[PDB]
């Protein structure tokens, strides 16, 4: 407890000795508390309007989806809130059979992830690639390293000085980075090294594997959410994530002890409060639930997520009982009998990227096996802990990782499965500018960045690409994409380039393809397919609306008005 961190809250201590003070009424309940201290507010109510797409997509001004969009908080009131609700709590203990068949399954689960790939240290080098107090891009260019390397030095000698969390500081994401990189650097939660994972295949290919997935027999496909799954991280799961260091080498398993048992397993937060004296920064702790702003919490949430719904598949096919899982004496025969024999197979029934997870059961027991997932503490969302969950038969239906799937027929006979969402969702976020004082010129690039991206992702939808057009009209020709549209992690921003979005569409759909056999190009936009008429409907589509009709048939005023205020550059006719 104190011997771990007791160093990181006399630093913070020491440099805010003024105005340190122990409120006696803090609000924490299951995090231990030890102090606070006064800064100033950090964030806003709302967000800016991209101008550009807005005056573009008209139609939607009158929608409540994207309306609400333009009001996210993050302000210290908003940031107490969301504490309330599901990071202020505690995670029962699992039961002694139900920590067995984990630590069983997540070595296991760990020998399988390892059996071609070593675990490495990461390197500044790498870090500063990446990035293409607190810090910015000014720092790897300083010697700034000078920081890292002695807090390195306490962190071989198993100790902690300044590695805090904020609800960050750059030195401290290097050193998680340098010991654990290696998991998202070195892809060991691909497809093809994990079976269930999906990292580095894109969100253009998650259909397919879905698709892929339906082919194998079995029951329905179910892709439970779970309630806060940052917050239901045990005890057990970090000791459990911890195994990984078993197949490193002394020096990298020794800075990786040290992430885990200092920075994971005991951790320093500081997070924003509002108070009737302004604005207090509090400072507390707990041994438990991860953190969402660290590198490989996706890599670590992934392979979670895969034990447990490997042992939930386990349950299901009658391999776990109640007895079982109450069980302190529970024997490993018939458990590590099932994973050498079946646990490959069943990996490759699952699509799992972090909390996201799609699974396809050998039938559909897995739908009432609930007692190991509620007794692991991943309780689904807005559902009765034993009511059983319902799966769906088709993969089209399926949700993951907030997207549905279409297959789609081309002209010539060819078959497309695009990514799909409430098409509500796709104009609200493009409407979104993130942050303040931008300029014309690179809110306009931003928009033409999410324009191209509905032209590679969300083609099929004749809202969007008529929106896309007419965005790629209204901005000059030469201007390039700024900042990022997704955030995401399946995002390959293939829309970033100036390149044709034609000859892009190809290279993504058709060349780079591996679902498409036929490689003939597409020569036209018009051979690019659209959803049905009523698939596009079911999905938000505008269309068949007198609004709609009449925003498309004036949108070249609108892109003109554009270009007016834009000034006098070089533009072309999308439309
Ligand atoms: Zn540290
Ligand atoms: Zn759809």
Redesign the pocket.
């Known amino acids: 407890n104190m011997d771990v961190i007791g160093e990181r809250i006399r630093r913070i201590k020491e440099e805010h000795s003024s105005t340190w003070h122990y409120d006696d009424e803090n609000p924490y309940k299951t995090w231990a508390y030890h102090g606070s201290y006064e800064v100033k507010a950090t964030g806003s109510a709302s967000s800016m309007i991209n101008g550009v797409v807005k005056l573009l997509t008209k139609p939607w001004d009158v929608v409540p989806t994207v309306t609400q969009m333009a009001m996210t908080d993050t302000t210290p009131f908003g940031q107490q809130r969301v504490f309330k609700e599901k990071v202020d709590t505690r995670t029962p203990k699992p039961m002694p059979g139900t920590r067995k068949v984990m630590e069983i399954t997540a070595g296991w689960l760990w020998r399988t992830l390892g059996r071609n790939k070593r675990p490495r240290l990461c390197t500044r080098e790498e870090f500063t690639k990446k990035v293409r107090d607190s810090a910015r891009a000014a720092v790897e260019d300083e010697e700034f390293w000078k920081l890292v390397d002695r807090?390195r030095e306490?962190?071989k000698q198993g100790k902690?000085?300044?590695?805090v969390y904020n609800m960050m500081w750059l030195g401290?994401r290097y050193?998680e980075f340098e010991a654990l990189g290696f998991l998202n650097e070195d892809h060991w939660f691909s497809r093809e090294n994990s079976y269930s994972g999906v990292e580095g295949e894109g969100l253009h290919k998650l259909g397919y594997i879905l698709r892929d997935i339906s082919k194998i027999p079995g029951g329905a496909m179910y892709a439970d959410d779970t309630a806060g799954w940052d917050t239901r991280i045990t005890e057990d799961d970090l000791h459990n994530e911890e195994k990984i260091t078993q197949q490193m080498d002394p020096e990298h398993r020794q800075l990786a002890n040290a992430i885990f048992k200092?920075?994971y397993q005991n951790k320093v937060v500081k997070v924003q409060r509002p108070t009737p004296k302004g604005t207090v920064m509090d400072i507390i702790s707990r041994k438990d639930q991860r953190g969402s702003g660290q590198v490989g919490t996706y890599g670590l949430n992934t392979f979670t997520n895969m034990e447990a719904q490997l042992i939930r598949q386990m349950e299901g096919e009658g391999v776990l009982s109640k007895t079982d899982l109450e069980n302190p004496h529970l024997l490993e025969k018939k458990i590590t009998q099932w994973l050498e024999t079946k646990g490959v197979e069943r990996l490759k029934r699952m699509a799992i990227s972090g909390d996201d997870c799609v699974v396809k059961p050998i039938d559909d027991r897995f739908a009432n096996a609930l007692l190991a997932l509620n007794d692991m503490g991943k309780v689904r969302k807005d559902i009765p802990q034993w009511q059983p969950s319902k799966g769906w038969h088709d993969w089209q239906q399926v949700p993951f990782c907030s997207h549905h799937f279409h297959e789609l027929i081309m002209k010539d006979g060819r078959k497309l499965v695009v990514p799909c969402r409430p098409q509500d969702e796709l104009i609200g976020r493009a409407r979104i500018s993130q942050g303040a004082g931008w300029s014309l010129k690179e809110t306009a690039c931003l928009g033409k960045a999410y324009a191209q991206m509905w032209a590679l992702m969300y083609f099929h939808r004749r809202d969007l690409r008529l929106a896309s057009n007419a965005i790629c009209s209204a901005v000059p020709v030469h201007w390039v994409p700024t900042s990022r549209t997704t955030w995401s992690i399946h995002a390959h921003h293939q829309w970033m380039t100036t390149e044709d979005m034609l000859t892009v569409w190809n290279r993504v759909w058709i060349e780079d393809n591996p679902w498409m056999e036929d490689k003939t190009p597409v020569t036209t936009w018009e051979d690019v397919p659209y959803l049905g008429k009523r698939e596009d409907q079911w999905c938000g589509s505008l269309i068949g609306l007198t609004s709609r009709a009449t925003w498309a048939q004036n949108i070249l005023t609108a892109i003109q008005q554009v270009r007016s205020l834009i000034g006098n550059e070089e533009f072309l006719d999308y439309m």
Not at 160 to 163: D, L, Q, Y
């Open positions: 807090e306490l962190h902690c000085g300044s590695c401290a050193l200092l920075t």
